[PDB]
Symmetry: D3
Subunit: 285 residues, 6 copies
């Protein structure tokens, strides 16, 4: 039962995604295509990375991840196809253990896989050039279809990964550089990485382990200032309801393990026009 999990910037308003799915079913009969999302901000490689970095442990072994925003479409660039190592457990009971090397990502070689590779490691990476799995005459503006969707379907059908093209050195895989959290005492500086739609919760790049280094744990009183102006105060709690009344401010670690801000069953970011990229300062005593 092959599965392709599909994340793109192709949108939800025309036939772009369906063209890809038709070909996926053409190449791999009985494939199941699971949509991640197709509404990421176009060409925002760091935003796309967030939508795909923690997928593996949720999916059956052998799942292929087709992940793409392709602003360099039509150029001599070629996609990269990678077998990751550690799935890094979700599910009922104690969850579902996944064996190493059980997932393949295929994407533009433009940094999209940066955090996937950082968190999971990888066993082998190849550039995708073989006309066995890509068109001999690719549509210049549609590499998300030609260089990702189509070869992802061959990989799901069991095309041997090592035959898609030559093996890449680690230096040939493009990566983006994320801003580091800055820690001084129990005072941390970071950024808003995302507005958690559709709730308007606010996600930061400050991880649980950053909090731990600052001696911040559950129940610690925090002050969080956004963009050096807008202040919030709350204890660190497991979840939204811990803020008490509807509308109250909660500080919590999100399901990804990162410090987040929210109103309890109300939207925090939207009424204040808050967006990703704002500076975050965290203070505890």
């Amino acid at each position: 039962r092959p599965i392709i999990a599909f994340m793109s910037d192709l949108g939800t308003t025309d036939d772009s995604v369906a063209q890809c799915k038709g070909l996926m079913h053409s190449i791999c009969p009985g494939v199941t295509v699971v949509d991640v999302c197709h509404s990421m901000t176009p060409w925002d490689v760091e935003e796309g990375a967030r939508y795909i970095v923690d997928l593996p442990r949720f999916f059956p072994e052998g799942t292929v991840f087709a992940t793409t925003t392709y602003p360099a479409t039509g150029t001599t660039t070629r996609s990269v196809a990678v077998r990751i190592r550690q799935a890094a457990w979700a599910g009922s009971g104690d969850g579902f253990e996944r064996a190493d090397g059980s997932y393949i990502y295929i994407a533009p070689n433009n940094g999209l896989l940066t955090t996937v590779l950082e968190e999971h490691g990888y066993i082998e990476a190849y550039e995708v050039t073989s006309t066995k799995v890509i068109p001999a005459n690719p549509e210049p503006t549609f590499y998300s279809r030609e260089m990702v969707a189509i070869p992802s379907a061959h990989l799901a059908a069991g095309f041997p990964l090592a035959e898609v093209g030559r093996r890449l050195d680690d230096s040939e895989i493009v990566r983006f550089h994320r801003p580091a959290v800055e820690i001084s005492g129990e005072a941390l500086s970071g950024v808003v990485t995302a507005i958690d739609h559709p709730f308007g919760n606010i996600w930061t790049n400050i991880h649980r382990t950053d909090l731990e280094k600052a001696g911040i744990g559950q129940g610690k009183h925090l002050k969080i200032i956004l963009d050096d102006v807008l202040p919030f105060e709350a204890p660190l709690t497991p979840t939204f309801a811990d803020a008490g009344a509807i509308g109250n401010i909660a500080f919590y670690l999100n399901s990804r393990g990162y410090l987040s801000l929210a109103r309890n069953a109300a939207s925090l970011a939207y009424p204040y026009n808050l967006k990703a990229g704002l500076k975050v300062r965290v203070e505890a005593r």
Copy 2:
């Protein structure tokens, strides 16, 4: 061929729904996940109820409905899993008769299933606590995944419903209270329950049976006033085209059996900024 029909407030812009689907396929290989919608207004239990109340007759028997907006995520609350009684026919010819007790809903116990239970009745309801079908260590902020998606997949795989947890008394199932239509002569008062996106038609809580009690039938001339200010007049007709010219006002019973307002092949609500919650007054003579 097991089917899970999935309705959530999780949105369409990140990997939340895909995490659920991966696990559903992990737990129930060969399951088909049919998306209802994932864009309901967060925490609006009455809006969610509308999207799920009339699903059963459309689906093959044995379908599991995973339906969730979970503002109490992370608390000691537990989901409820319910086998409904009457499917309450759709399809070609005279439609498809569905046997009693053929569908299971699983949802937060927060009133989401209120109208499902009212229209279909139910045979048996259980709280979902067994670590055979939920995580032993659930992600606090993600009960829509942990307490709905994951156990819905076990139920679809044939996990016995009565083993998910203890059986609930009817008093333990939370319900919301809907405002009643008020009837005086052939004058009715109700509310706008929904803007019918993407058309901008206007749906009210005034049912066919309310109209019947007021002696209002097909062709009756009506005056409908919204929010005690904005007036419309038309005869009650079966459909949009019966208004005549494009843009003309039609009054009709929607596919759910409720009195609705529309412009013929044009949007009524959007140009006038009309939204759910407005008072509705209906007058006939």
Copy 3:
């Protein structure tokens, strides 16, 4: 492995599409429903046509296309079901050749299939009236479900096309009339047919063959004026990156073969409030 590719104006915010899919699975067990899109501008038959005209070559033979915007819902009108001739190749290598007569469209008879029929031709067309494949008592406002979704599933299950109703003459199939490109020297006049969401690229009705007639080929310097006011200049290039710096203007043939405008990895239409329908004038020397 039957496939229905589903394009509608039913939206993504309620249970409308799921009601259709439930019935499709009810009628054709093991069917795969592939969503094209459901967010087309309601009742815009020319916009819908664009989303479905080039689908066939992407899909396995035997695929049924269920395509619908149905403003005449509830009237005596009946859908048309058509076996097209030429699929008109996509895929790896030299692509996937599709045999003639391998696809069926079913749609309102309201012009939606106009360009499908123009580009592919057709072998046979029927009105859909048999209560073997439509309801004996159709919901007046829901013909997209009753007259398209339901019979599309019977066709996918192998219901013989010629038995859905009587065979239509070509004169009985409604068509819309598209505005023609006007060519004078190497000066062309057309219109913006679409904003290419989510990128904000601008698509025109000026085809590669129109450019060829004007002696315009790759590298030719063009001036394009929108709405007789807003000017742009660039050489014709294969793709976005050929504009050079991020934000620079590119002129290119889109994946459909039509002259298009874009900023390189930035949105052209949105900052300038540009929308479909604007006049397009093209000048070369």
Copy 4:
């Protein structure tokens, strides 16, 4: 104590109006410049016309009206300056303005000066005029006018000379009536028990709705105070109310009121609430009026 009442499309965000006023004071020391408004939709002469046609009876005799939207600035066109005949009564009833029984205004006692582009159409129609002149004399306009600023050069500057007592007939040659540009207004159509017209304006900042159906139109149709009416907008919104003097007659806050506005025309509104703004109702919607 001369007065220039100044209506333009120059806006309120830069020094354009002040340049005009500086010059008005330079030419007519002691002048008072009374702003009408400066926010009209640029180049909409029919909107501009509504802001100036009712002014004369409110002002002291001798007042000069400098009124201008000038899209033909810098061309060979020249402004028209005109002495009107009747100051004219106005309002829901038709009366002189002021305390007591109001202030009767003498004939021939106001001058309008404007681009000759139709801006004065309803001024001339409602007030009549004695003689009209094109404005060409370099005694009252620049010898070398700023091409893009005729609202200053050909309206503000000569209006101040006129306010200072410069003889109107010496601004340039007399115009024939046929040389005066006019726009054409939609007529009200009248059946016995009914009337059709149009929304002419949203009454800012309240959101009241003004139509072109005049008191005299109502009278011809046998409609007077207290008459139960239906007023349908856009053939889709059938409002019902009696014709009343004012908003509060509708009773509760928010209730629909039908009334003659302060210009003498049938209008709709909500009592101390905005009718047009919540529902995006705008000028140009068709109006049907029916006696019930």
Copy 5:
């Protein structure tokens, strides 16, 4: 050289204000009409009140304040005209306005005329008054007032007669204090180290935030210049800053400042940046003040 200071809800987009001014000049030749503002939210008497309560000390004695939002226009209601007692000192400190030590204003030297609908509540509260009269004499209002335009008929027109020297006591009968409509304002609540109040206004066009906590409230709570404060908005935004004279005392551009505004009330802002606009902060948010 009489002055009428004119505050209305008539807006700045049509000829309504000019009609009023034309009549003011007709009645009081030589008058100067000083616009206060005309953009107040229609029918919001508490907002209108804030625009007029601090005016007297800024104007020459004899100045008449014509202040009006008139949703009851055209009813049997009549305007109130009143001679106030104390011009009153104001500001962050409480002083006379002007150069040097400021200009002391004599008592009984300003008249307000307004709809009797509560608009003058804080004027009367802060200044006191000698006598109040309903405005009924057709010496100073029309015999047949335009029903929808009492702001012109019952405020503008009589204000000009008063400016011209018409005796206040002859405008109509004396009112008892109980006949003067008043609105009720939220009181500041005071604990020893803390205070609760409300945002009364966003200070346009800067986006500063004004509260109802007055200097005298701070003094009662032992809070003076330099005191470290917390000001929490909407029980969700806990701003912290010392109380300072002005914006630049916050240091860097964009930093939060707490200060007494020019009306004497505790306010919050950013130094040469907008506080309220980027975050959609609006009047009505709860305020909690704490000494730190």
Copy 6:
């Protein structure tokens, strides 16, 4: 008949401007306060500068310009008051304003008073000045200025004393030229057949586009009336048109026009249509000009 021309960032929605005017009349009875505009973007001194630099030639000699955006209000800063030298000619051609050949203005005949924060940069640059003084005397400012309201305390109030004839040199000590704060403006870059600059302003309410390329810049580049030009905005929109006197020279309504604006700078627009608004074109876009 003294005049104060008043430009501020105080806005048009509350009583701030009226407080200033009340005081101006208190100090200079008989003064006329001519509003320039009050809607400038707060604290944008370069925008404020554009609203005041062209004023002098339009006003009678002796006119005082009170011009203020004051983000440093309440600090030790003091306003600068200055007698300018040349009133200066202006416009597309460079001429005196007014009828006939215009009104020549004497030197040394206007005073500007402003925060010393660069607001007067282009005023001083284009007009020159005789002497500049810091404003400190309590004869003309309050002994105890309202900390947040220096636009009133340190500009409005002393401007009225100056209008009343108070000797400029007695407002405080003479400043050295180096003590006058200035902002720095982008220079136009000139190649033989081409020029680069910037959009300085959108011309509201029309949506015309103003650049910093001056008539004298065009002359240096050999560009005169009728010259076929290309003007590229943001290196993405290559407009083409001949240089013409005015908008209507473009022919049909909506056609692109290139012209020298009333301030003397190269501008782009559509003939009786808005260029900038439909496409969200704003100040700050780069400009390239090419002779064709």
